[PDB]
Design brief:
The structure is cut from a larger assembly and holds four copies of chain A and one copy of chain C (281 residues). With 47 residues, chain A is an all-alpha fold. Helix content of chain A is 21%, strand content 0%. The longest helix of chain A is centred in the N-terminal third of the chain and has 5 residues, at 4-8. In chain C, the strands form three sheets. Chain C has a five-stranded mixed sheet with strand order 2-4-5-1-3. Chain C has a three-stranded antiparallel sheet with strand order 6-10-9, with no helix packed on it. Chain C has a two-stranded antiparallel ribbon with strand order 7-8. The longest helix of chain C has 22 residues, at 237-258. In chain C, a hairpin with a 2-residue loop joins strand 4 and strand 5 (77-81). Chain C has helices at residues 14-21, 45-48, 55-61, 136-151, 161-167, 186-205, 213-217, 224-231, 237-258; strands at 3-7, 27-30, 36-38, 66-74, 77-81, 89-92, 169-172, 175-178, 265-269, 275-279. Classes of the chains: A mainly alpha (47), C alpha+beta (281). Chain C: One of its GO terms (molecular function) is structural molecule activity. Chain C: One of its GO terms (cellular component) is viral capsid. Chain C: InterPro entries: Herpes_capsid_2.
Chain lengths: 47, 49, 281, 48, 49
């Protein structure tokens, strides 16, 4: 993606649906084309 | 347990529409962000709302 | 059907469709010829990734393909008009040969100097286009496949490879391509027989006037063709008519062995040398 | 582009659609300057 | 052919001041486009004007 739009622009905090857990979901690619950060992400502020 | 009843349903399809503001996003780079005008108000508003 | 709307069916990019937007007028083969096809069939790449993968099986395969012309590339719809026999169509160049206005073009399987990404290896699938060569490079690259298959008949194991490398750098107009490490295959062998049979009958029909013509000409003339070919009576003309004609049956056949299908015949070439008005499928 | 074609047997021209692009170059400028900590300390504590 | 001449000159910088919507565009697809809403006006109006 161009993930920075999701990083800065407002969210769709919506009724969601997960199978097992979201980390296992993205580690099985239940979700297609994810992105994952444990840390306080600094790359959303360098553009 | 099967009950046979009339179900409320839509009688037409949905509308997803390209704004004037959204059409420039096409001829810039072919990829369309929905609510592209809505996030425009958001940057002159706070950080994320 | 003629107009072929194409499903992409893969996950393409903006950088994909930008390339085909400038490639409108390219040659794409389709096997099934529907109005609605998917990109599994549309494109030539899906058979050049075979496991045997020699020029002997790819050339004989794609003469059952049906060529189309790229039109109306916006987003995910590919309009492919199947050309009709004898209308003028323009064609964007897919291979670096300048096509030299006024001549017949053909269909070359794939570059086969490596495996070129024809568009972009999208989901490990690229869309590779045929080369459209001006029938001189087509016949020559098909000649040398049988030249070096006749060579491997009477060589042991190395004077093939010492003489294929002599003959594989084909220096053509704008292109120096490579014979694909010639594999001896039976589609060559069934037709290498009939070539060797066609060479036999010309020796039978050579009625000692057609024979001795160069060997009588070297006594009188000094020509460039006459000197390079030094190293390399009867009152029956009506019979010589029939023997020369039966000789012409063979040479219109033994050329047709190594020649290809006549295809797009050049109307005009742009000064850009990229888009070429062409008639005659 | 303009266009001009002429005569018979004289070649002609098709469409040359020109979209050129010119770019930028970054060159950030930087100067240092030094201030002594005693000079700052006179602002800091300001003795008797 | 030389005069010492009082010549008019800008005392101030110019302002390439992004639309907040243009910043929405740059976070959307990394392509600031000059006078974005004016191009949207040209979409709802004649294209090549």
């Amino acid at each position: 993606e161009n993930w920075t739009a999701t990083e800065l622009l407002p969210k769709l905090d919506v009724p969601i649906d997960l199978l097992t857990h979201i980390k296992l979901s993205v580690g099985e690619e239940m979700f297609n084309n994810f992105r994952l950060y444990y840390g306080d992400d600094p790359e959303r502020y360098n553009l | 347990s099967i009950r046979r009843t009339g179900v409320k349903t839509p009688a037409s399809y949905g509308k997803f529409v390209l704004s004037k503001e959204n059409a420039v996003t096409a001829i810039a780079h072919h990829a369309i962000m929905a609510d592209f005008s809505q996030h425009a108000d958001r940057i002159q508003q706070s950080s994320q709302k | 059907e003629t107009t072929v709307l194409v499903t992409f069916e893969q996950r393409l990019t903006t950088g994909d469709v930008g390339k085909l937007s400038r490639l409108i007028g390219a040659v794409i083969p389709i096997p099934y010829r529907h109005h609605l096809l998917g990109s599994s069939q549309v494109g030539l790449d899906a058979v050049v990734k075979d496991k045997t993968r020699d020029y002997s099986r790819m050339r004989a395969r794609m003469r059952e393909m049906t060529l189309t012309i790229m039109r109306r590339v916006e987003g995910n719809q590919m309009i492919l008009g199947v050309p009709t026999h004898g209308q003028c169509y323009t064609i964007r160049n897919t291979g670096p040969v300048s096509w030299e206005k006024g001549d017949v073009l053909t269909t070359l399987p794939p570059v086969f100097s490596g495996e070129v990404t024809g568009l972009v290896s999208v989901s490990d699938w690229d869309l590779v286009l045929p080369w459209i060569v001006p029938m001189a490079l087509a016949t020559e690259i098909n000649q040398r496949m049988m030249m070096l298959a006749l060579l491997s008949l009477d060589r042991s194991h190395e004077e093939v490879r010492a003489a294929t490398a002599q003959l594989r750098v084909v220096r053509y107009r704008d292109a120096t391509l490579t014979l694909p490490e010639i594999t001896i295959d039976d589609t060559v062998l069934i037709d290498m027989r009939n070539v060797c049979i066609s060479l036999s009958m010309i020796a039978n029909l050579s009625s000692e006037v057609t024979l001795a013509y160069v060997r009588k000409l070297a006594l009188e003339d000094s020509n460039m063709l006459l000197m390079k070919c030094q190293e390399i009576y009867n009152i029956t003309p009506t019979e010589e008519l029939n023997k020369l004609t039966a000789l012409f049956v063979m040479i219109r056949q033994i050329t047709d062995v190594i020649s290809e299908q006549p295809a797009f015949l050049v109307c005009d070439v742009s000064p850009d040398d990229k888009s070429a008005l062409c008639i005659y499928k | 582009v303009p266009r001009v074609a002429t005569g018979a047997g004289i070649p002609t021209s098709r469409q040359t659609t020109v979209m050129v692009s010119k770019y930028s170059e970054k060159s950030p400028i930087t100067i240092p300057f030094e201030i002594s900590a005693a000079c700052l300390t006179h602002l800091k504590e300001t003795f008797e």
